[PDB]
Design a protein around this ligand. Structure first.
Ligand SMILES: *[C@@H]1O[C@H](CO)[C@@H](O[C@H]2O[C@H](CO)[C@@H](O[C@@H]3O[C@H](CO[C@@H]4O[C@H](CO[C@@H]5O[C@H](CO)[C@@H](O)[C@H](O)[C@@H]5O)[C@@H](O)[C@H](O)[C@@H]4O)[C@@H](O)[C@H](O)[C@@H]3O)[C@H](O)[C@H]2NC(C)=O)[C@H](O)[C@H]1NC(C)=O
Ligand SMILES: *[C@@H]1O[C@H](CO)[C@@H](O[C@H]2O[C@H](CO)[C@@H](O[C@@H]3O[C@H](CO[C@H]4O[C@H](CO[C@H]5O[C@H](CO)[C@@H](O)[C@H](O)[C@@H]5O)[C@@H](O)[C@H](O)[C@@H]4O)[C@@H](O)[C@H](O)[C@@H]3O)[C@H](O)[C@H]2NC(C)=O)[C@H](O)[C@H]1NC(C)=O
Ligand SMILES: *[C@@H]1O[C@H](CO)[C@@H](O[C@@H]2O[C@H](CO)[C@@H](O[C@@H]3O[C@H](CO[C@@H]4O[C@H](CO)[C@@H](O)[C@H](O)[C@@H]4O)[C@@H](O)[C@H](O)[C@@H]3O)[C@H](O)[C@H]2NC(C)=O)[C@H](O)[C@H]1NC(C)=O
Ligand SMILES: *[C@@H]1O[C@H](CO)[C@@H](O[C@@H]2O[C@H](CO)[C@@H](O[C@@H]3O[C@H](CO[C@@H]4O[C@H](CO)[C@@H](O)[C@H](O)[C@@H]4O)[C@@H](O)[C@H](O)[C@@H]3O)[C@H](O)[C@H]2NC(C)=O)[C@H](O)[C@H]1NC(C)=O
Ligand code: HEM
Ligand code: HEM
Ligand SMILES: *[C@@H]1O[C@H](CO)[C@@H](O[C@H]2O[C@H](CO)[C@@H](O)[C@H](O)[C@H]2NC(C)=O)[C@H](O)[C@H]1NC(C)=O
Ligand SMILES: *[C@@H]1O[C@H](CO)[C@@H](O[C@H]2O[C@H](CO)[C@@H](O)[C@H](O)[C@H]2NC(C)=O)[C@H](O)[C@H]1NC(C)=O
Ligand code: BOG
Ligand code: BOG
Ligand code: BOG
Ligand code: BOG
Ligand code: BOG
Ligand code: BOG
Ligand code: BOG
Ligand code: BOG
Ligand code: BFL
Ligand code: BFL
Lengths: 553, 553
């Protein structure tokens, strides 16, 4: 008897439950539909769906008519729309979280064990006829072949939106505080127990590590002086585990919150900027609160930096990424009248979607000098040799690669995409089309509709055999991009919900925490409300270089 | 310079923050008040407080006019009132949680480290003129003296509401799933990381322990047969750490989720009933779902038992406790249209408040036999000797002692109260009157007003010197009791918020989880919806004895 849930019979988030030896029932509770497979719409459900413009038309509206948007952005309409965006996008993510790699049903273990990444759609049943369920071949295309054929970069394709490396390293630094897959436990497990913006990549993901990194004086983080400049301390003064190639002297190993940041100067660059921001904030707090001890100074600075991070990510990072003329706004109060849960659980699908390796260039240009991957990766003297300002200027000037479209991952890191595809199969992620529906989009009827071209589509069709067998990650990177965009609609329609839910679901955005006293008063609250990338760098450097998420003109 | 916040200047939940060397500022954000101390009301705030009837009057309305409540309870008005109770009570509890024993301010560590009990009011600053702030003497009364003088029972005082031992043991059993203070870490720390109704007292507070307790067959829990009846397994069969006096071998110990349950037959009685219920539910689930494996049967049954627990607690436990003519109702759907966070963090004040030792009798009567504490405590055969039905019948017929009013704690366990008072001082809990205000009541102006009498009031007055120096726990237990009630208004006004928040804050009550599929379908969902104390017992025993939370008429 073939497992009926392998046919993915339940639609619109209805829940498929096996009954008896060969039957099944769909739980349509609060889905807005009824019927055996939750396909019969209620009045409002129908109106909403038949009158709702497509993601492509909305994307069009949001990226045209700057004159009208400039007007709108200066009115209450800016808040009305930002609220709509926030609520409509986040409503797609279940909270409290539902499934994980071990349970394809709600359970107390899935709810309480935070070492697990959560998941939005259950896994493909292990007893299905094919790897993807019912469609496709008995064996999926070879991961290595799939990557070399469709993901490997031939000629560098720059992001048409003007995104640069300053943005690419920001994204890598930022996401690594919540994507920390455990090697020991395996796929489906994380070590970033904070499941969000807790800044564990600065303060450490565990208490013992945090303590080794702290100076325990004035609430500050340990540091060292080099060429009269402030940098993270060496592992000798802050005995913390760091992932460095064997043979590298401890004196040349910098100690920071995230163990893998010694991998790239671009990562240590941000680690340095934030470390300096932390100590700088500590100084501001101390002047305002001379009676405070080291602990409160440290904890309050952390909250301020968390706020500064969310602010910059929404108003500058996501702004650059979206390309929207609507001025995004970070304002927790926009949700104080709505039903919203201030909690977040990182999804394995979100982890998959954020592998933006295509952003990395062919080489790294620092002034007249061009540096190869071998001169850049694990280079422990570049940051100190050039200093923060020089690297920020350089990264802000060099363009990053386009993410969507295919064939744009540098050969030096193509192996990551290969492992991502392999991980996807161990996690038994459902097919791309099931995720399209889960996120409110119509499934693609053919590979041609997906890619927008004919040659790659024909080859994919031969390899997968059926569009309904196309996998999650390949689908995301091979989907045709929006006009002049960094990526396709699925990346936005699927990524926006996870991202927004992750940003606003932070406890500091709750009515309980979002108050001046939480940040030490008006001074600290204002630091959060008015934070910018430019201020983050220039208030912590001797000179002010060109700083931005987009290349200059 | 005296610490300005030692005077507890900020009112109505305003937050006191130290500025400069000797100044302070109150953050009145969203309190509904403004001004230096958060005392100037906004028009609506004033309107609401002036029209608000007193807790005494509302208590009067809820305990009179049966004819009217009989009409109300059979209509939608019952639901309207329950929702009001729910939202208004839970709104007094901060969520996300605020402080803990280490931080008297919001911090990321307080939010993320669940080993800490949270707290509603910050601690008494360590640099205050007196132990309670600025009022009272430089030295608090001796804890032992206080207990002997005002808490020690002289003549057993039965609860006037008819509460029995079946209720007392249920309460002790139930609360021990979320109150597990860590001896190793000390005051302020808990081992019950679930912080709520997770049934960890049945399944264990950690995974390793849960695995030792499970049969891994049919989703069931290990068990043993004795005299043809089902009981928890021995430690020899389920090797988990149980706290038994030294010398008692593993084969003679019973292994259950909570390590301290071997202490009393009353606790193991409930451990036995719930274990039978778990396995009984597994049977019903397997009949409906023959394809389900052991893990899903186990997890689903746990969710059902959690649901049955909350149902019984709200509609029978709290109902008995309140004495309201209003028929309380457990219906998560009542909050779906409101703003509510589905999370809970156990407060140290709630732990203190729940020390209901006065409930325990002078001796334990089982039919013709009367057992002393010496014969009852640590008795390893009584449960099996009498069987479940017999003990339930016996406990359901024996009256429990009155909680409030004072002088009603059996000398055998008075030492617990002494330690609660000592613990309170290590935690530096603010005075009783500060808590009265935090929970919407007027502070008491004298001990006479507090106790309602003159003898104890005069002595307390001399020991403490000032009503504003009275401590939390002593205050709760010495407050005058409502007419014919089990305890005073403070117990209700402070206890209800914590209780209701903890019950409805459970994720199974969220819109995401409260669906039939979560419980395996309609059969499991109805088990939750129609759960009853009588059914919990009678469907798991050979015969059906007298079972209730109140003695028979
Ligand atoms: C979050 O969730 C993850 C995933 O579940 C947790 O992972 C870890 O915990 C699991 C449970 O501890 C680990 O499971 C392994 O199970 C192996 C098999 O053991 C079996 O169970 C008992 C073993 O006990 C037996 O009897 C005596 C009794 O004392 C015992 O001393 C003796 O050793 C004997 O084996 C038995 O019934 C069976 O026959 C099996 O032996 C273990 O051998 C192994 O050590 C481990 O416990 C799992 O591997 C862990 N890691 C991962 C990645 O899964 C994680 O702990 C959870 N986190 C939290 C905070 O809950
Ligand atoms: C939830 O919250 C609780 C409460 O904070 C927390 O408690 C435990 O964790 C902390 C931190 O691990 C424990 O700290 C204890 O105090 C001392 C700290 O002082 C010393 O620490 C270092 C000593 O060892 C190191 O010294 C050399 C330097 O010469 C260094 O090179 C080596 O690395 C070496 O290991 C040192 O840096 C410093 O100078 C001091 O000597 C700890 O050392 C000690 O081990 C203690 O552990 C608490 O005691 C823990 N329990 C309690 C009750 O506080 C929980 O861990 C937390 N839970 C979670 C999940 O976060
Ligand atoms: C970690 O990063 C540091 C950078 O801080 C690396 O050190 C730097 O390495 C560069 C390249 O080896 C050094 O180059 C300098 O400038 C010229 C560059 O070459 C010139 O341009 C092209 C290239 O051949 C030709 O057309 C020109 O004729 C000319 O050759 C070089 O010739 C100079 O000799 C000089 O070295 C740079 O000086 C150096 N910086 C410092 C402070 O050492 C470092 O190698 C890297 N570590 C590792 C292990 O890769
Ligand atoms: C754990 O609990 C069990 C009960 O489940 C304890 O065992 C039981 O102990 C009682 C008394 O200790 C035994 O009593 C039986 O019946 C009479 C009762 O006494 C009578 O009533 C009064 C009392 O003096 C007098 O007026 C009468 O003359 C008469 O004495 C007793 O006399 C009998 O000898 C008989 O023991 C009961 O039988 C026993 N149950 C079993 C099956 O063992 C057990 O002690 C306890 N463990 C500990 C450590 O206390
Ligand atoms: C040239 C620079 C880069 C190098 C050397 C690099 C490297 C790596 C390696 C070695 C891994 C782990 C692979 C495995 O376990 O198989 C990884 C993972 C990952 N990378 Fe990159 N990467 C780069 C850039 C970036 C960028 C710019 C982003 C975009 C935000 C990013 C995102 C991620 C994510 C989300 C993961 C998974 C983390 C996890 O599960 O722990 N990377 N990368
Ligand atoms: C036969 C009677 C009982 C005995 C022997 C007993 C005993 C004890 C002991 C020995 C402690 C721990 C004290 C310490 O660490 O200093 C404790 C705690 C506790 N007891 Fe009782 N008790 C009884 C009844 C009850 C009842 C009826 C309730 C009410 C629901 C209750 C509730 C509590 C609570 C809430 C704690 C604190 C738990 C914690 O923080 O871990 N007890 N008791
Ligand atoms: C509900 O979903 C099922 C599952 O795909 C649909 O398919 C079933 O019913 C068909 C109608 O006759 C049969 O032809 C299929 O063999 C049968 N498949 C399975 C797995 O049982 C079903 O038609 C859908 N019903 C509705 C109303 O949409
Ligand atoms: C605000 O609260 C403070 C603290 O309770 C009040 O007390 C301060 O001001 C009084 C005015 O005469 C003095 O008598 C007190 O000594 C002084 N105490 C402190 C904290 O320094 C204050 O009156 C209140 N003010 C308002 C506006 O209500
Ligand atoms: C009510 C006024 C409607 C005007 C119709 C505007 C037409 C915009 O049309 C849009 O063009 C895009 C490409 O430029 C496509 O990607 C979108 O799918 C399409 O809807
Ligand atoms: C309330 C929010 C309204 C957002 C609507 C913005 C959409 C801008 O729409 C623009 O209108 C222009 C009309 O002169 C056209 O010429 C542009 O092609 C079109 O994209
Ligand atoms: C927070 C929910 C508010 C519902 C009010 C109805 C207003 C409908 O609002 C619509 O929602 C769509 C998404 O479903 C958007 O794509 C449309 O642009 C928006 O106008
Ligand atoms: C014209 C301006 C419109 C502003 C509203 C945009 C925000 C609504 O965004 C909508 O979110 C939904 C759920 O994730 C998606 O299914 C829709 O395709 C998307 O347009
Ligand atoms: C029509 C509305 C009338 C509002 C009158 C406001 C009454 C509250 O008045 C306030 O009472 C506090 C406590 O006694 C004082 O500390 C404040 O200074 C006082 O303004
Ligand atoms: C009996 C009259 C009651 C009036 C209710 C006051 C409503 C709140 O009024 C507010 O007062 C603030 C302080 O001056 C102003 O800054 C705000 O603009 C104003 O809206
Ligand atoms: C909608 C909620 C209404 C709550 C009101 C219930 C209060 C019952 O009130 C009772 O009414 C009786 C009338 O016969 C009086 O005799 C009692 O003294 C009075 O306490
Ligand atoms: C007549 C029936 C009334 C039902 C409403 C009772 C529920 C509201 O209860 C109220 O909760 C507040 C916050 O905890 C307390 O401050 C009030 O004193 C209390 O009466
Ligand atoms: C505002 C806009 C929307 O809601 O449309 C939006 C929000 C978030 C992202 C995002 C961020 C990170 C990864 C992937 C996607 C993209 C667009
Ligand atoms: C419904 C009623 C109300 O909200 O009035 C209520 C709710 C809860 C308790 C309670 C529970 C445990 C300890 C202490 C108190 C008491 C009364």
């Amino acid at each position: 008897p073939v497992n009926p849930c392998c046919y993915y019979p339940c639609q619109h988030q209805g829940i498929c439950v096996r009954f008896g030896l060969d039957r099944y029932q769909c739980d349509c509770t609060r889905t807005g539909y009824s019927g055996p497979n939750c396909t019969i719409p209620e009045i409002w459900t129908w109106l909403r769906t038949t009158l709702r413009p497509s993601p492509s038309f909305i994307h069009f509206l949001l990226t045209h008519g700057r004159w009208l948007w400039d007007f709108v952005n200066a009115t209450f309409i800016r808040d009305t729309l930002m609220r709509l965006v926030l609520t409509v996008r986040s409503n797609l993510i279940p909270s409290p979280p539902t499934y994980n790699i071990a349970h394809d049903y709600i359970s107390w273990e899935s709810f309480s064990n935070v070492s697990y990444y959560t998941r939005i759609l259950p896994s493909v049943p292990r007893d299905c006829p094919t790897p993807m369920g019912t469609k496709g071949k008995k064996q999926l295309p070879d991961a290595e072949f799939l990557s070399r054929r469709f993901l490997l970069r031939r000629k560098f394709i720059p992001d048409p939106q003007g995104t640069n490396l300053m943005f690419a390293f920001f994204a890598q630094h930022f996401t690594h505080q919540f994507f920390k897959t455990s090697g020991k436990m395996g796929p489906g497990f994380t070590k970033a127990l904070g499941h969000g913006v807790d800044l564990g990549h600065i303060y450490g993901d565990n208490l013992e590590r945090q303590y080794q990194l702290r100076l325990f004086k004035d609430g500050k983080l340990k540091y060292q002086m080099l060429n009269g400049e402030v940098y993270p301390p060496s592992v000798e003064e802050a005995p913390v585990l760091m992932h460095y190639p064997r043979g590298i002297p401890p004196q040349s190993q910098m100690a920071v919150g995230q163990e893998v940041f010694g991998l790239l100067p671009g990562l240590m660059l941000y680690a340095t900027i934030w470390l300096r921001e932390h100590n700088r904030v500590c100084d501001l707090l101390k002047a305002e609160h001379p009676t405070w001890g080291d602990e409160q100074l440290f904890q309050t600075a952390r909250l301020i930096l968390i706020g500064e991070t969310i602010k910059i990510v929404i108003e500058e990072y996501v702004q650059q990424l979206s390309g929207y003329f609507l001025q995004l706004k970070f304002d927790p109060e926009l949700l104080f009248g709505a039903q919203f849960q201030y909690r977040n659980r990182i999804a394995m699908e979100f982890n998959q979607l954020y592998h933006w390796h295509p952003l990395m260039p062919d080489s790294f240009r620092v002034g007249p000098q061009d540096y190869s991957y071998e001169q850049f990766l694990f280079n422990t003297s570049m940051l100190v040799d050039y200093g923060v300002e020089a690297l920020v200027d350089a990264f802000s000037r060099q363009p990053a690669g386009r993410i969507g479209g295919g064939r744009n991952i540098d050969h030096h890191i193509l192996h990551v995409a290969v492992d991502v595809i392999k991980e996807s199969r161990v996690l038994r992620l459902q097919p791309f089309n099931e995720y399209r529906k889960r996120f409110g989009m119509k499934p693609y009827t053919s590979f041609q509709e997906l890619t927008g071209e004919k040659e790659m589509a024909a080859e994919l069709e031969e390899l997968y055999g059926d569009i309904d067998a196309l996998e999650f990650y390949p689908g995301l990177l091979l989907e045709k991009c929006h006009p002049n965009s960094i990526f396709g609609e699925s990346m936005i329609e699927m990524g926006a919900p996870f991202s927004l839910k992750g940003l606003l679901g932070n406890p500091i955005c709750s009515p309980e925490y979002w108050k001046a006293s939480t940040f030490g008063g008006e001074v600290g609250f204002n630091l959060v409300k008015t934070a910018t990338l430019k201020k983050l760098v220039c208030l912590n450097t001797k000179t002010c270089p060109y700083v931005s998420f987009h290349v200059p003109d």
